[PDB]
Amino acid sequence: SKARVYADVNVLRPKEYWDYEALTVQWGEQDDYEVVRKVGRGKYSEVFEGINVNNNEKCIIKILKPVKKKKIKREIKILQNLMGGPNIVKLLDIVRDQHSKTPSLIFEYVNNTDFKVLYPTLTDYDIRYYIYELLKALDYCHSQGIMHRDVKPHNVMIDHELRKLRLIDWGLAEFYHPGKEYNVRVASRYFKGPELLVDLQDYDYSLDMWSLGCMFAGMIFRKEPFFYGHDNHDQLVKIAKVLGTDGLNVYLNKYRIELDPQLEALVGRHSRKPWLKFMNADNQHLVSPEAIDFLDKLLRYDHQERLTALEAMTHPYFQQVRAAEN
Ligand SMILES: O=c1cc(-c2ccc(O)cc2)oc2cc(O)cc(O)c12
């Protein structure tokens, strides 16, 4: 399998662009940036609101947990390559503690509201707006040869006052090369595409569009997370119970993949559940025919069948957002 768009990006570009292991980091001054308060954390980092003591402007200090050289260089290289692209978080500096060599990444500050409290307040129009802004970031990173591989609401910072969105945490992101087999242990469980769950390793940018579809379904149906599996096997079961197993079998046959007998037994056989079955009184004002058409075009087993980010942005679902911008 191969990406249907942007497959040649890293091929045309000089090796320096994608050869992240050859990067040599130029370290800033640790002292320039002071921690004000903790804002977040995950398996690989802790995140603090900070102050640049020179200009007294706010920043984000991302303190990395013990990480291998290769992986830190990958995140840094991707951030540098993408710096300045639409709605991509801006990496401003890279610093380290002299004693322990603990690295911190320094970013622009976004006055975020956590999705668990933000998303339930969003109007129909705001959902269309913010999904469009997120699509700008994804089309940009894909156009630059990069898959994010961890799209989820936790990685989308929104200053709802300034209507500003940034796609953050490029720590799982990778360069796309035609024919390459990737680790499937990427993306957060609830946002893992079928490709990850059935061990299809030669995946591409389309993985992010599945994750976006999950995020989107969660928003319009007010069911967060939308596919709620307890482990990676259960995650495929949850998907199969929505999309149906008939669709799953054609997919598996196309890419000549056989499931583990344990997984096959858990998946069983399931009818397709139409999208309107998720509609209720609470989500009613969000679940229009255009929303459904758009969602249906993202949540496809076959990664080659999903809308590209560029296509998604042209969907009639976003026509009002485009018109406002034009
Ligand atoms: O402005 C923010 C930026 C970041 C951030 C987190 C990881 C990155 O690679 C880059 C930026 O995380 C946050 C996490 C929060 O809970 C709140 C934030 O405002 C931010």
Contacts of 306 (CB under 8 A, 6+ apart): 206, 209, 210, 213, 297, 298, 300
Q: Which residue has the tokens 């292991």?
A: 21
Structure tokens at 287: 């679940």
Ligand 1 first shell, C-beta below 6 A:
39-40, 47, 60, 62, 89, 107, 109-110, 112, 157, 168-170
Contacts of 129 (CB under 8 A, 6+ apart): 163, 321
Q: Which residue has the tokens 């259960």?
A: 234
Measured in angstroms, the resolution is 1.6
Residue 157 to residue 298: CA distance in whole angstroms: 22
45 carries a ligand binding annotation: yes
Residue 109 to residue 324: CA distance in whole angstroms: 26
DSSP secondary structure string for all residues of 160-197:
TTTTEEEE---TT-EE--TT----S--S-GGG--HHHH
Percent of the chain that is helix, strand, coil (3-state, to 5)? 45, 15, 40
Structure tokens at 305: 């069948």
Q: Which residue has the tokens 């799209």?
A: 151
Ranges in the chain annotated CATH 3.30.200.20 = 19-109
Residue 57 to residue 53: CA distance in whole angstroms: 8
Give the distance (Å) from ligand 1 centre to CA of residue 34.
16
**Architecture in CATH of 1-18+110-326:** Orthogonal Bundle (1.10)
Ranges in the chain annotated CATH 1.10.510.10 = 1-18+110-326
Query: Best mutation site among 39, 46, 47, 88 for ligand 1, i.e. most ligand atoms within 8 A of its Cβ?
Result: 47
Residue 262 to residue 275: CA distance in whole angstroms: 28
Catalytic residue flag (residue 150)? yes
Domain 19-109 has CATH 3.30.200.20: yes
Omega into 225 within 30° of 0, i.e. cis? yes
Q: Tell me how long the chain is.
A: 326
Asked whether the beta carbons of 267 and 248 are under 8 A apart, the reply is yes
Taking the CA of residue 45 as reference, the ligand 1 atom at the shortest distance is 7
Query: Which helix (H) or strand (E) segment is 107 a member of?
Result: strand 103-108
Contacts of 273 (CB under 8 A, 6+ apart): 241, 242, 243, 244
Nearest CA to ligand 1 atom 10: 168
- Please give the backbone phi and psi of residue 15, each rounded to the nearest 5 degrees, phi first: -50, -40
3-state SS, residue 9: helix
**59, β-bridge pairs:** 50, 108
Experimental method: X-ray
3-state SS, residue 147: strand
Instruction: Choose, from 150, 169, 204, 208, the residue flagged as catalytic.
Output: 150
Query: Best mutation site among 60, 92, 166 for ligand 1, i.e. most ligand atoms within 8 A of its Cβ?
Result: 60
